[PDB]
Every structure is written in structure tokens, then in C-alpha cells.
Amino acid sequence: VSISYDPIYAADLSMGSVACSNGDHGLMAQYPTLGEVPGFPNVGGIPDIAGWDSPSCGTCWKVTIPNGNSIFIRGVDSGRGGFNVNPTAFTKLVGSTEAGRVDNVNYVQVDLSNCINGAN
């Protein structure tokens, strides 16, 4: 799998613009703004989201790279083929944004508490 980062998932990004908008999996209800469900700097799109109401929305995952570092990303948007997260999370996981996209990234699902504990 290949991972990248997008500048749109910033703190003032409205949740109505992502696939998880209201419906049953909508996160806008309790958290109408991005910066609490994932935490703030641990949010990104993921390939397991279908659309307006993905069944895997709100799922914690750990991303690991060959350098030896990992962060927790909570599902929020869908991806064509790879995991995309905020540029701040990308720089922290790799060290800089010069890499752009890194393939062969290992990912594993963990308890939700770990995502909130890591982000905070």
C-alpha cells in the first residue's frame, strides 16, 4: 500500500465535505468539526470507506514505515488506493514531506482507546 498526505484535512475543514457526512456513521453529530474524533493531527482518508455512510468509518489503525516510526489514523474519508493523512501527521511519521508517497506501508487495526491516547 502507498500513503500520502493532503492539505485539505486541516482543523477548520468542515466534516460535510467528506464521505462520513451525517447518516448513521456521520461524525458531525457529536463532533460537527474535525479535531476530536481522530484527535486533530491523526485524521486521514482510508481505502475502507464506501461513501456518504461507510460501514468502517470511525476505525483506529496504526501505520508503520521502514525507517521505524508509526502513528494512529482514524477513518474519516475514502481513498482510491492508499492511506492519506494530514501533512503534519505525515511529516511526523517520516520526518519530512519531501518523500511525498511511500509504498509498502504496514497497517494494523487496534483498540479505539489507543487512537485517542496517541493523538492526545
PDB file of N, CA and C in Angstrom, residues 42-95:
ATOM      1  N   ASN A  42      -4.397  13.373  13.722  1.00  0.00           N
ATOM      2  CA  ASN A  42      -4.361  11.910  13.432  1.00  0.00           C
ATOM      3  C   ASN A  42      -5.575  11.528  12.585  1.00  0.00           C
ATOM      4  N   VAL A  43      -5.891  12.341  11.613  1.00  0.00           N
ATOM      5  CA  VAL A  43      -7.061  12.061  10.735  1.00  0.00           C
ATOM      6  C   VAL A  43      -6.610  12.013   9.271  1.00  0.00           C
ATOM      7  N   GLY A  44      -7.163  11.098   8.518  1.00  0.00           N
ATOM      8  CA  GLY A  44      -6.783  10.964   7.085  1.00  0.00           C
ATOM      9  C   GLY A  44      -7.793  10.070   6.376  1.00  0.00           C
ATOM     10  N   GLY A  45      -7.731  10.027   5.071  1.00  0.00           N
ATOM     11  CA  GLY A  45      -8.663   9.161   4.301  1.00  0.00           C
ATOM     12  C   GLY A  45      -8.141   7.729   4.341  1.00  0.00           C
ATOM     13  N   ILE A  46      -8.998   6.767   4.131  1.00  0.00           N
ATOM     14  CA  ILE A  46      -8.555   5.348   4.143  1.00  0.00           C
ATOM     15  C   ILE A  46      -9.394   4.542   3.114  1.00  0.00           C
ATOM     16  N   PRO A  47      -8.762   3.571   2.481  1.00  0.00           N
ATOM     17  CA  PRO A  47      -9.431   2.737   1.421  1.00  0.00           C
ATOM     18  C   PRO A  47     -10.647   1.920   1.902  1.00  0.00           C
ATOM     19  N   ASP A  48     -10.941   1.875   3.178  1.00  0.00           N
ATOM     20  CA  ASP A  48     -12.106   1.043   3.639  1.00  0.00           C
ATOM     21  C   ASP A  48     -13.380   1.876   3.836  1.00  0.00           C
ATOM     22  N   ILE A  49     -13.478   3.007   3.189  1.00  0.00           N
ATOM     23  CA  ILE A  49     -14.714   3.847   3.310  1.00  0.00           C
ATOM     24  C   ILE A  49     -15.465   3.799   1.971  1.00  0.00           C
ATOM     25  N   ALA A  50     -16.747   3.519   2.005  1.00  0.00           N
ATOM     26  CA  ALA A  50     -17.531   3.408   0.734  1.00  0.00           C
ATOM     27  C   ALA A  50     -18.038   4.758   0.238  1.00  0.00           C
ATOM     28  N   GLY A  51     -18.637   5.559   1.084  1.00  0.00           N
ATOM     29  CA  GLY A  51     -19.147   6.866   0.588  1.00  0.00           C
ATOM     30  C   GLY A  51     -19.824   7.671   1.697  1.00  0.00           C
ATOM     31  N   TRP A  52     -20.996   8.169   1.410  1.00  0.00           N
ATOM     32  CA  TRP A  52     -21.747   9.013   2.387  1.00  0.00           C
ATOM     33  C   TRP A  52     -21.947   8.327   3.742  1.00  0.00           C
ATOM     34  N   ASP A  53     -21.896   7.016   3.803  1.00  0.00           N
ATOM     35  CA  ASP A  53     -22.097   6.324   5.112  1.00  0.00           C
ATOM     36  C   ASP A  53     -21.273   5.032   5.176  1.00  0.00           C
ATOM     37  N   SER A  54     -19.974   5.144   5.107  1.00  0.00           N
ATOM     38  CA  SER A  54     -19.109   3.922   5.135  1.00  0.00           C
ATOM     39  C   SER A  54     -19.342   3.114   6.423  1.00  0.00           C
ATOM     40  N   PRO A  55     -19.326   1.800   6.302  1.00  0.00           N
ATOM     41  CA  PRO A  55     -19.535   0.938   7.488  1.00  0.00           C
ATOM     42  C   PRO A  55     -18.263   0.870   8.342  1.00  0.00           C
ATOM     43  N   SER A  56     -17.124   1.162   7.758  1.00  0.00           N
ATOM     44  CA  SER A  56     -15.847   1.105   8.527  1.00  0.00           C
ATOM     45  C   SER A  56     -15.436   2.498   9.018  1.00  0.00           C
ATOM     46  N   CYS A  57     -16.325   3.460   8.968  1.00  0.00           N
ATOM     47  CA  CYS A  57     -15.962   4.831   9.436  1.00  0.00           C
ATOM     48  C   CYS A  57     -15.749   4.817  10.953  1.00  0.00           C
ATOM     49  N   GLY A  58     -14.772   5.548  11.426  1.00  0.00           N
ATOM     50  CA  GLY A  58     -14.511   5.598  12.894  1.00  0.00           C
ATOM     51  C   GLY A  58     -13.731   4.357  13.340  1.00  0.00           C
ATOM     52  N   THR A  59     -12.747   3.953  12.576  1.00  0.00           N
ATOM     53  CA  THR A  59     -11.936   2.754  12.955  1.00  0.00           C
ATOM     54  C   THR A  59     -10.463   3.143  13.122  1.00  0.00           C
ATOM     55  N   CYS A  60      -9.898   2.746  14.228  1.00  0.00           N
ATOM     56  CA  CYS A  60      -8.476   3.092  14.549  1.00  0.00           C
ATOM     57  C   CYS A  60      -7.481   2.176  13.823  1.00  0.00           C
ATOM     58  N   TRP A  61      -6.396   2.733  13.336  1.00  0.00           N
ATOM     59  CA  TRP A  61      -5.358   1.903  12.649  1.00  0.00           C
ATOM     60  C   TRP A  61      -3.963   2.457  12.930  1.00  0.00           C
ATOM     61  N   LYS A  62      -2.970   1.609  12.932  1.00  0.00           N
ATOM     62  CA  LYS A  62      -1.579   2.078  13.171  1.00  0.00           C
ATOM     63  C   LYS A  62      -0.788   1.970  11.866  1.00  0.00           C
ATOM     64  N   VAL A  63      -0.062   2.996  11.505  1.00  0.00           N
ATOM     65  CA  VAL A  63       0.719   2.946  10.232  1.00  0.00           C
ATOM     66  C   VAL A  63       2.214   2.872  10.546  1.00  0.00           C
ATOM     67  N   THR A  64       2.904   1.924   9.961  1.00  0.00           N
ATOM     68  CA  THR A  64       4.362   1.746  10.245  1.00  0.00           C
ATOM     69  C   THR A  64       5.208   1.899   8.977  1.00  0.00           C
ATOM     70  N   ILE A  65       6.370   2.498   9.099  1.00  0.00           N
ATOM     71  CA  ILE A  65       7.255   2.678   7.903  1.00  0.00           C
ATOM     72  C   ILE A  65       8.607   1.961   8.125  1.00  0.00           C
ATOM     73  N   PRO A  66       9.341   1.750   7.045  1.00  0.00           N
ATOM     74  CA  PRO A  66      10.654   1.036   7.124  1.00  0.00           C
ATOM     75  C   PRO A  66      11.681   1.782   7.984  1.00  0.00           C
ATOM     76  N   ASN A  67      11.532   3.072   8.144  1.00  0.00           N
ATOM     77  CA  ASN A  67      12.509   3.843   8.979  1.00  0.00           C
ATOM     78  C   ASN A  67      12.400   3.407  10.442  1.00  0.00           C
ATOM     79  N   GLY A  68      11.198   3.189  10.896  1.00  0.00           N
ATOM     80  CA  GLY A  68      10.991   2.750  12.306  1.00  0.00           C
ATOM     81  C   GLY A  68      10.175   3.795  13.061  1.00  0.00           C
ATOM     82  N   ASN A  69       8.977   4.056  12.613  1.00  0.00           N
ATOM     83  CA  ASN A  69       8.108   5.048  13.304  1.00  0.00           C
ATOM     84  C   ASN A  69       6.654   4.803  12.906  1.00  0.00           C
ATOM     85  N   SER A  70       5.720   5.112  13.767  1.00  0.00           N
ATOM     86  CA  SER A  70       4.291   4.874  13.418  1.00  0.00           C
ATOM     87  C   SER A  70       3.357   5.864  14.119  1.00  0.00           C
ATOM     88  N   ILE A  71       2.199   6.051  13.551  1.00  0.00           N
ATOM     89  CA  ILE A  71       1.175   6.974  14.128  1.00  0.00           C
ATOM     90  C   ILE A  71      -0.194   6.307  14.016  1.00  0.00           C
ATOM     91  N   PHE A  72      -1.194   6.803  14.706  1.00  0.00           N
ATOM     92  CA  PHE A  72      -2.536   6.154  14.606  1.00  0.00           C
ATOM     93  C   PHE A  72      -3.484   7.029  13.785  1.00  0.00           C
ATOM     94  N   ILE A  73      -4.100   6.458  12.785  1.00  0.00           N
ATOM     95  CA  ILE A  73      -5.035   7.243  11.925  1.00  0.00           C
ATOM     96  C   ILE A  73      -6.457   6.698  12.062  1.00  0.00           C
ATOM     97  N   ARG A  74      -7.418   7.554  12.309  1.00  0.00           N
ATOM     98  CA  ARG A  74      -8.821   7.078  12.443  1.00  0.00           C
ATOM     99  C   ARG A  74      -9.552   7.339  11.124  1.00  0.00           C
ATOM    100  N   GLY A  75     -10.298   6.371  10.657  1.00  0.00           N
ATOM    101  CA  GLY A  75     -11.012   6.516   9.352  1.00  0.00           C
ATOM    102  C   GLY A  75     -11.895   7.764   9.340  1.00  0.00           C
ATOM    103  N   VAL A  76     -12.052   8.361   8.186  1.00  0.00           N
ATOM    104  CA  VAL A  76     -12.912   9.577   8.053  1.00  0.00           C
ATOM    105  C   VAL A  76     -13.327   9.775   6.573  1.00  0.00           C
ATOM    106  N   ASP A  77     -12.443   9.504   5.636  1.00  0.00           N
ATOM    107  CA  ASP A  77     -12.767   9.659   4.181  1.00  0.00           C
ATOM    108  C   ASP A  77     -12.303   8.411   3.418  1.00  0.00           C
ATOM    109  N   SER A  78     -12.682   8.281   2.168  1.00  0.00           N
ATOM    110  CA  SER A  78     -12.264   7.086   1.371  1.00  0.00           C
ATOM    111  C   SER A  78     -11.038   7.404   0.511  1.00  0.00           C
ATOM    112  N   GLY A  79     -10.330   6.387   0.084  1.00  0.00           N
ATOM    113  CA  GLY A  79      -9.118   6.611  -0.752  1.00  0.00           C
ATOM    114  C   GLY A  79      -9.171   5.731  -2.002  1.00  0.00           C
ATOM    115  N   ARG A  80      -8.731   6.260  -3.109  1.00  0.00           N
ATOM    116  CA  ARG A  80      -8.717   5.475  -4.385  1.00  0.00           C
ATOM    117  C   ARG A  80      -7.832   4.231  -4.245  1.00  0.00           C
ATOM    118  N   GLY A  81      -6.711   4.365  -3.584  1.00  0.00           N
ATOM    119  CA  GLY A  81      -5.794   3.197  -3.416  1.00  0.00           C
ATOM    120  C   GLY A  81      -4.616   3.571  -2.515  1.00  0.00           C
ATOM    121  N   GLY A  82      -4.859   3.732  -1.239  1.00  0.00           N
ATOM    122  CA  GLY A  82      -3.749   4.078  -0.307  1.00  0.00           C
ATOM    123  C   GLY A  82      -4.281   4.894   0.870  1.00  0.00           C
ATOM    124  N   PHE A  83      -3.469   5.078   1.874  1.00  0.00           N
ATOM    125  CA  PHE A  83      -3.884   5.861   3.074  1.00  0.00           C
ATOM    126  C   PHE A  83      -3.353   7.294   2.972  1.00  0.00           C
ATOM    127  N   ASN A  84      -4.208   8.274   3.141  1.00  0.00           N
ATOM    128  CA  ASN A  84      -3.747   9.693   3.055  1.00  0.00           C
ATOM    129  C   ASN A  84      -4.036  10.406   4.378  1.00  0.00           C
ATOM    130  N   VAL A  85      -3.075  11.099   4.940  1.00  0.00           N
ATOM    131  CA  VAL A  85      -3.327  11.787   6.248  1.00  0.00           C
ATOM    132  C   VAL A  85      -2.869  13.244   6.208  1.00  0.00           C
ATOM    133  N   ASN A  86      -3.143  13.989   7.251  1.00  0.00           N
ATOM    134  CA  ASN A  86      -2.716  15.425   7.279  1.00  0.00           C
ATOM    135  C   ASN A  86      -1.199  15.526   7.051  1.00  0.00           C
ATOM    136  N   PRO A  87      -0.760  16.642   6.517  1.00  0.00           N
ATOM    137  CA  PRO A  87       0.687  16.831   6.266  1.00  0.00           C
ATOM    138  C   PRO A  87       1.444  16.878   7.588  1.00  0.00           C
ATOM    139  N   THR A  88       0.808  17.271   8.662  1.00  0.00           N
ATOM    140  CA  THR A  88       1.518  17.294   9.973  1.00  0.00           C
ATOM    141  C   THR A  88       1.756  15.854  10.435  1.00  0.00           C
ATOM    142  N   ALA A  89       0.795  14.985  10.240  1.00  0.00           N
ATOM    143  CA  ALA A  89       0.986  13.562  10.648  1.00  0.00           C
ATOM    144  C   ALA A  89       2.029  12.929   9.734  1.00  0.00           C
ATOM    145  N   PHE A  90       1.968  13.235   8.467  1.00  0.00           N
ATOM    146  CA  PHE A  90       2.971  12.668   7.507  1.00  0.00           C
ATOM    147  C   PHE A  90       4.394  13.089   7.898  1.00  0.00           C
ATOM    148  N   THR A  91       4.609  14.358   8.127  1.00  0.00           N
ATOM    149  CA  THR A  91       5.980  14.847   8.480  1.00  0.00           C
ATOM    150  C   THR A  91       6.473  14.177   9.764  1.00  0.00           C
ATOM    151  N   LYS A  92       5.591  13.993  10.702  1.00  0.00           N
ATOM    152  CA  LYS A  92       5.997  13.355  11.989  1.00  0.00           C
ATOM    153  C   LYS A  92       6.315  11.871  11.788  1.00  0.00           C
ATOM    154  N   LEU A  93       5.544  11.194  10.980  1.00  0.00           N
ATOM    155  CA  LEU A  93       5.791   9.736  10.753  1.00  0.00           C
ATOM    156  C   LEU A  93       7.076   9.498   9.948  1.00  0.00           C
ATOM    157  N   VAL A  94       7.303  10.262   8.910  1.00  0.00           N
ATOM    158  CA  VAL A  94       8.529  10.042   8.071  1.00  0.00           C
ATOM    159  C   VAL A  94       9.668  10.960   8.515  1.00  0.00           C
ATOM    160  N   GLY A  95       9.345  12.164   8.884  1.00  0.00           N
ATOM    161  CA  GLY A  95      10.385  13.138   9.320  1.00  0.00           C
ATOM    162  C   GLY A  95      10.287  14.397   8.458  1.00  0.00           C
TER     163      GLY A  95
END
